[PDB]
Design a protein around this motif. Structure first.
Motif, short mmCIF file in Angstrom:
data_model
loop_
_atom_site.label_atom_id
_atom_site.label_comp_id
_atom_site.label_asym_id
_atom_site.label_seq_id
_atom_site.Cartn_x
_atom_site.Cartn_y
_atom_site.Cartn_z
N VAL A 167 0.85 -1.15 0.00
CA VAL A 167 0.00 0.00 0.00
C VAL A 167 0.91 1.23 0.00
O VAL A 167 1.84 1.34 0.81
N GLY A 201 1.20 5.27 0.07
CA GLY A 201 0.61 6.58 0.34
C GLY A 201 0.05 6.66 1.74
O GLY A 201 -0.40 7.73 2.17
N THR A 202 0.10 5.55 2.46
CA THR A 202 -0.58 5.44 3.75
C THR A 202 -0.41 6.67 4.62
O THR A 202 -1.41 7.30 4.99
N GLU A 203 0.83 7.01 4.93
CA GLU A 203 1.08 8.03 5.94
C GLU A 203 1.07 9.47 5.43
O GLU A 203 1.44 10.39 6.16
N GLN A 247 10.21 11.64 -9.82
CA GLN A 247 11.16 10.65 -10.32
C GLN A 247 10.41 9.44 -10.81
O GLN A 247 9.57 8.89 -10.09
N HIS A 289 12.74 1.94 4.40
CA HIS A 289 12.17 3.06 3.67
C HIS A 289 11.45 4.02 4.62
O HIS A 289 11.65 5.23 4.56
N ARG A 324 2.70 13.03 -1.11
CA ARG A 324 2.99 12.20 -2.27
C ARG A 324 1.71 11.78 -3.03
O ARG A 324 0.67 11.55 -2.41
N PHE A 329 7.12 8.57 -8.67
CA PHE A 329 7.18 9.33 -7.44
C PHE A 329 6.88 10.77 -7.73
O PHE A 329 7.45 11.37 -8.63
C1 HEM Z 1 10.42 3.24 -5.91
C2 HEM Z 1 9.88 4.34 -5.39
C3 HEM Z 1 9.11 4.31 -4.06
C4 HEM Z 1 8.32 3.35 -3.55
C5 HEM Z 1 8.00 1.99 -4.19
C6 HEM Z 1 7.84 3.82 -2.26
C7 HEM Z 1 7.00 3.11 -1.45
C8 HEM Z 1 6.54 3.50 -0.22
C9 HEM Z 1 5.68 2.70 0.63
C10 HEM Z 1 5.13 1.30 0.25
C11 HEM Z 1 5.47 3.40 1.76
C12 HEM Z 1 4.62 2.96 2.98
C13 HEM Z 1 3.19 3.53 3.01
C14 HEM Z 1 3.11 5.04 3.01
O1 HEM Z 1 3.07 5.63 1.90
O2 HEM Z 1 3.03 5.69 4.10
C15 HEM Z 1 6.20 4.65 1.63
C16 HEM Z 1 6.27 5.66 2.55
C17 HEM Z 1 6.93 6.85 2.35
N1 HEM Z 1 7.78 7.16 1.28
FE1 HEM Z 1 8.08 6.12 -0.41
N2 HEM Z 1 8.36 5.09 -2.00
C18 HEM Z 1 9.13 5.41 -3.12
C19 HEM Z 1 9.86 6.55 -3.31
C20 HEM Z 1 9.95 7.53 -2.37
C21 HEM Z 1 10.81 8.69 -2.43
C22 HEM Z 1 11.78 8.95 -3.61
C23 HEM Z 1 10.58 9.41 -1.33
C24 HEM Z 1 11.19 10.74 -0.81
C25 HEM Z 1 11.61 11.70 -1.64
C26 HEM Z 1 9.58 8.69 -0.57
C27 HEM Z 1 9.07 9.14 0.60
C28 HEM Z 1 8.22 8.46 1.43
C29 HEM Z 1 7.69 9.06 2.61
C30 HEM Z 1 7.91 10.47 3.19
C31 HEM Z 1 6.84 7.98 3.24
C32 HEM Z 1 6.05 8.11 4.56
C33 HEM Z 1 7.07 7.69 5.63
C34 HEM Z 1 6.44 7.84 7.00
O3 HEM Z 1 6.43 9.00 7.57
O4 HEM Z 1 5.92 6.80 7.50
N3 HEM Z 1 9.21 7.55 -1.22
N4 HEM Z 1 6.84 4.68 0.41
#
Ligand code: HEM
Ligand code: HEM
Ligand code: HEM
Ligand code: HEM
Lengths: 309, 308, 308, 308, 308, 309
Positions: free
Chosen positions: F147, F149-151, F180, F221, F239, F256
């Motif tokens: 999932v 985008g959760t947070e 990206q 992550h 996001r 992204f």
């Molecule tokens: C291959 C690219 C990426 C994938 C597959 C990915 C996937 C995910 C997933 C599965 C989550 C957990 C659910 C949630 O959205 O809260 C997450 C959280 C997050 N991701 Fe990504 N993401 C990607 C790229 C990025 C990039 C490039 C950034 C930052 C510039 C980023 C920033 C974040 C942030 C800020 C969270 C919330 C973290 C929190 O406060 O819990 N993501 N991402």
């Protein structure tokens, strides 16, 4: 039965359009009418295909008099004009109509658009004599506040009840439909208590449950429209009633439209309602509802409709 | 098929009501029950017609014993009470039930209302013995987190699998249905890895893909519930399983409900599950799930049901 | 129908996926491919069951050359490769394809996920040679702005038009499908007035009404694609066209896909479009549309597909 | 907003009801009417709460003469009766109306039922003088075939365009609404080519794209209804137009209803349409559309309405 | 407001979960509870984000006593345990509860999943004392067959009625909520005529119209629950009542849940209901409904909740 | 926020379109671009009004280089080209783009139609350099099966995180967005067990629950994209990621796209991901995901966007 004319068995819809027209007396008029109705699949798809769900349907009915202009020596076994009835206080008049278009869809615009295209194609060859825009009212209710359509037969039962079979092979798949536009006296109906209304109908108001036998009046709408022949066989009709109205002219209405493989069933129902069983024991819905039209139409199967002329 | 009772072949729904009742020993009871069920079309339409889409359906099941109180001279080839199973580790009970109401709709209120009207019309003539409120859980999953019902037969395959045919012509269109109310040990299931859970079920968890033949355990739920006869012909059931639960009672269930033209098929599945094939090689789903009920019913065709 | 392979008569959908593939030369490649397509119901349900509505469908087509590698035993009466057409102005190429997957659903993710599972399962045994992601455009329009599909046969007419019957009983239930990927010259199309466009197609643009018999040009798309035998009987095909494109490549397309129980009907429409009737009097739609692919497939019934 | 009277800024709906009424002469009539409209939230919720979505809305308008019978104490700055217009070819009549009920919902039954309760509650105290049942027509089109409403202001722009602010603080939150019921000459409209129709309106027909500045005629509907002050600031109105008609009477209509915080903006559009800018250069839409009614109302805020 | 805890002002939903828990006396318990609830946004989003529409909401209530274990130095002006009532005929108990989870969504599965995750994260630190699964019944009705929630304040009226304001600034945005699980005597209610039922409630049954002033009994539920102060000012609560039931246990309930910026308003309603006004003139709804629970909670603003 | 350009705070949608273009070097090119983007409300409503729900939205972003051509001496405080990063095995390249259109709707046709109209209006004045058609994948998941985008912050939290405030008053209501286009190695990712994938992400796969602290790796992550400043204040981004792919070219991707009132937050996140914290302790999602683009854009508020030129 997607986007196919003469789909009598369609389930209930949110919007409908009932158009009744009288054809012009000329040979041109007859030929134009014949072109339009025999090609009715054209505007049906022209309009209906634009909605992904394909909810739009159109049933064409032809009156006994106009049938004899277009198909002189091939005639379904029971096609005749509507039989008017005259009770002491309530009557079912017989009113003009050579063509019925019974149009249903999930949306108003689709019904309206098809009607527009049909009316445009007919031009001077036919005149609208009755037009009713039906709508679903809450949980499938009529303006009397009762769920309306509950006991309609479905599936195989609906086919058995509505559609001409082996009795009349040349017109298998066709049907006979009767319409009556009822107007209600809402004031008078509101002077009744719910319990009295339930006795008039034969079912509970909110919950739509059939009254048990020991509480079910012999002149209830339900009792009077229950048809069992000598052999003990039940005979049903398929109804597609809809609410309609005009707040400014204080019209609150129910459009009755019932299909049967043999209109003798519908006619017997009507005579039980208006004349009583036993005689004088008439349907009290009629104290609150007055029919302004009454017309019978033959609904040809697709194959027969497409052959006309 | 709209608002017709005994519609076994209906697709999955967002909500379910499973009602199991026992009838009174009395003769007024036999009669009342007989009136309610032979006229079940009445309440079905009374409730279902109120929803434009007409999603409401109701399959009525009759237990073997109560079927004998009501239609003595005629009986379907394979009607009998639920055969209990006593396996190496795990057991399937045979619990009481004369009447099954398998209700489905797009909405809860329609299920509840129909149930309410069925129960009210039966009055003292019968008593609710098991009530389950089933619900769709995410993308067709059970509470074990797997997509549940994937391999169900559809359309013609489904009719051939579930509906009595030329082989018992007096009861054509009928079916045999078995229910079992399963309760899960969620803590225990949670100590398995996803991969171990997949080995138990027989399919990948998120993606709902069937394991390759070379990676498919011989005691996986899928292997055990695969039935092929001596001629090489597969035999399937139609399941309408739903999730259910209570957070305060820590109950997390899968309600099993399977339809077949012949309960021998379902009974063999249960046998391979509980006893194992080869013997002792049982279904590990059973290590995390316990059957609290176990009842068999005949589903009469709509014609047969309306005569009674 | 519901989650059954080879459902030719499905109504239009919001989304679709057209995948054309060429199979490898080895007997291994030919066995992997046969394994995948003959078991296509597996992935179909694995993905499709996850949607309550069950909208996902998948029709598998097999090209003539590949069919011979797999069933030199028996052939459907009209299976041959697509016939290229060389008209006075426009040409329809015949391009490679051993397998077609025509996938439809209410949602893009379902189509994509089914395609993903199919392609993964085929691995090195096949190569994607054409891939198109179709989408519904407003009220059933193509990118030329016209309602596209209006006159498709429905119900019994659809089955009589598309499904093989008594004329070739060994392959009853099957069909024949032709695909062509068309790209449009949008700036050229827009230089025409709406009225000119209407005369090209044969119907009015917004209202989708067939032009009167005496305002219908003899080379209108509708006129040329009307097939009437000597006994006055019309012969129709079943089209499932969708829009597609890419804004960066300036690609604006209509994916043509037409099913018929006899492909000569479809072929005759094509000849009358490309070569004209009378010769020279060709379809002006082709002045704004260029076919980049052209492939014929046999669509085996479920039974025949499942035995391959 | 949700089930609140006087919600001027509601987005478009599938259905609407326009009711115009004249009140009786007696002080009794004036008290019944005041009682009904000041308590309009009652019926609004009585009907509206029955739909989960809560789409039902109701805006009450009060004409200048009636407002004086009820609040000779204080007047909104721009309340006066509708001004008839007499142009070189077309005229906009001023017709009677003391009360307007502008009702919208996702469903016809909700609009009808709210209207029913309102009319019943008013009884003999008022008479319906115009009643129109509006409906959405395809992708937001009017019966002329054009997307109708495209350039409505939304969000903050809508509030700044329609809602009375600092300029008249005693009636902040209120609005002014003009209704005109237009009937179309459909056969005349259809003699025009699409291109001619496009030049009449100011946008392309299917695609709903504003004509380029240099292809926009000076008398296009869009041009004439563009209001720009001396400081270069555009002044917009909020329109909630719907289609209506009757096939038997050959009535095909567009119900115009336009809200503005200052009705002079709306009036100036009307003058430029009927009289032309420059004089003589009038709106060609009026060559195919005839206004059968013309009425101005003040739309009091909830607070002011509830104190009447 | 999407996926934010403490969203008191959310519209009605198809499904509800009402969870009442008591905390452990232990200090690990105080801490765990404190972690789960101050981070409630976590599970809310974990579940709710999985649904495109984001309908899931969760209001956390804290009992007076447990509030003292966790925020000793600061307390809202009107936090106290539920005042029991002992009336002439009917009594309202004060039952235990430290924690309230008022969960709403478009779907059951979302409610259940969120509940499941809340209960699991609390572990042994707290125990479920009351669990109710609420559902929408037809057109917003309770199981007594009346539309239930009609007169609820909306939008600004709703914020003013339910949300702590300038009068207790340290707790702005918070609310006070009272629950009572009512069980109905369906047989007894059914022996009344529709008209008698209408007299009890205060509104017509099918049409949901408020009785005329001259026909409105002084002990009707509506009269008794109408609160006007000495200055002539009305004071309202926000109710989110849902139906619930079990057919086997013959339980048919209305779950009462009312929010107010000041519980004095709700307490006075309860007092007029149970004690009568004038005394002995009590709410006849009480003759057919019995309160099985009765608990008051403080609903902290999202800021206050996240500090703990 | 119905049919208003620059609606950064829109909730997730079923379909999206991401268009990145490079403007031509001429003054004509600059002026055409400026006309199109400053009148973007035109095609937004031309397209979006046709869907009753009004789901269509369009956010316009402008690159640092093109901004200086159109607004030389008025500039948001933190507008600069994307900062490329270079880790030992994974890099975030900086790739061209002067214009971003981030388009969302409930349907594909609406996204496509708006893009068509925008591209048509720009003509020779700009060239598409990247185009991605995003789609919702099951229950809000990405192609890694988690999932996604959760947070994300919502409501007031979303406004606080995404939108320029008092720090830079001249551009209040604007935002900074980074894109990206990631491509996944699906094979390699499938060699991992679910439990290993969960450790890579920081949350459980099916159930989307955050791993507890004692089980949460320091290079997850989630951990790496958790930003708390010295004062103990959390800093979030918004996001709008979407799946995309091509089965024939074996592209399975996540687009992204993150908005922040100050791109320092997004940049710090990226450097924690690519460079590690502690150094070398990098984000393992990057073992399975490779960024093919990287571009930063300023998102002007409606009032500023409409003023351009
Ligand atoms: C291959 C690219 C990426 C994938 C597959 C990915 C996937 C995910 C997933 C599965 C989550 C957990 C659910 C949630 O959205 O809260 C997450 C959280 C997050 N991701 Fe990504 N993401 C990607 C790229 C990025 C990039 C490039 C950034 C930052 C510039 C980023 C920033 C974040 C942030 C800020 C969270 C919330 C973290 C929190 O406060 O819990 N993501 N991402
Ligand atoms: C004012 C016009 C009418 C109204 C308001 C009305 C209303 C109703 C209602 C509320 C029911 C109970 C639910 C159900 O549909 O099963 C009903 C049943 C029925 N009505 Fe009508 N009806 C009208 C006219 C007619 C007419 C003219 C006929 C016969 C020609 C008719 C035939 C029937 C039949 C056959 C049933 C089903 C009876 C049964 O087998 O239980 N109705 N009607
Ligand atoms: C705790 C109760 C049960 C659970 C949680 C459960 C779960 C599952 C799951 C997740 C699947 C794979 C997806 C599918 O094809 O439906 C499945 C398949 C199946 N189950 Fe069950 N099941 C349960 C009880 C039973 C019982 C009692 C029977 C037999 C009486 C049964 C018969 C089957 C069959 C026939 C299949 C399809 C096998 C195939 O051909 O692939 N299940 N079950
Ligand atoms: C068995 C439990 C209850 C049932 C079945 C019930 C039912 C109803 C119904 C049918 C209405 C009219 C429609 C509406 O405006 O919502 C209503 C109104 C109302 N009820 Fe209840 N109610 C119950 C308990 C309570 C309790 C315990 C309270 C107070 C603590 C309460 C306060 C109210 C209020 C304030 C109104 C709106 C009155 C007005 O201004 O018209 N209710 N209720």
């Amino acid at each position: 039965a997607r986007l196919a004319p003469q789909a009598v068995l369609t389930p209930p819809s949110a919007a409908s359009l009932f158009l009744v027209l009288v054809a012009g007396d000329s040979d041109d008029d007859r030929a134009t009418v014949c072109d339009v109705i025999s090609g009715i699949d054209g505007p049906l798809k022209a309009v209906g295909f634009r909605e992904l769900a394909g909810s739009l349907s159109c049933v064409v009915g032809v009156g006994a008099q106009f049938w004899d202009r277009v198909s002189a020596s091939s005639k379904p076994a029971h096609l005749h004009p509507f039989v008017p009835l005259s009770g002491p206080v309530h009557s079912a008049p017989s009113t003009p109509g050579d063509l019925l278009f019974h149009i249903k869809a999930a949306r108003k615009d689709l019904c309206f658009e098809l009607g527009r295209q049909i009316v445009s194609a007919l031009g001077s060859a036919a005149t609208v004599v009755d037009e009713v825009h039906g709508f679903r009212y809450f949980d499938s209710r009529d303006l009397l506040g009762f769920v309306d359509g509950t006991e309609n037969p479905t599936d195989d039962d609906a086919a058995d009840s509505a559609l001409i079979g082996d009795e009349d092979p040349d017109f298998r798949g066709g049907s006979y439909v009767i319409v009556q536009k009822y107007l209600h006296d809402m004031s008078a109906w509101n002077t009744l208590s719910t319990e009295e209304q339930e006795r008039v109908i034969g079912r509970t108001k909110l919950e739509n449950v059939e009254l048990d036998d020991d509480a079910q009046p012999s002149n209830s709408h339900v009792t009077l429209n229950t048809i069992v022949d000598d052999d003990g066989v039940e005979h049903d009709i398929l109804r597609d009633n809809m609410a309609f109205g005009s707040l400014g002219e204080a019209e609150y209405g129910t459009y009755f439209i019932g299909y049967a493989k043999d209109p003798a069933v519908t006619e017997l129902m009507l005579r039980r309602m208006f004349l009583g069983e036993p005689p004088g024991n008439y349907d009290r819905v009629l104290d609150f509802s007055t029919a302004a039209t009454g017309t019978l139409f033959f609904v040809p199967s697709r194959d027969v409709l497409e052959s006309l002329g």
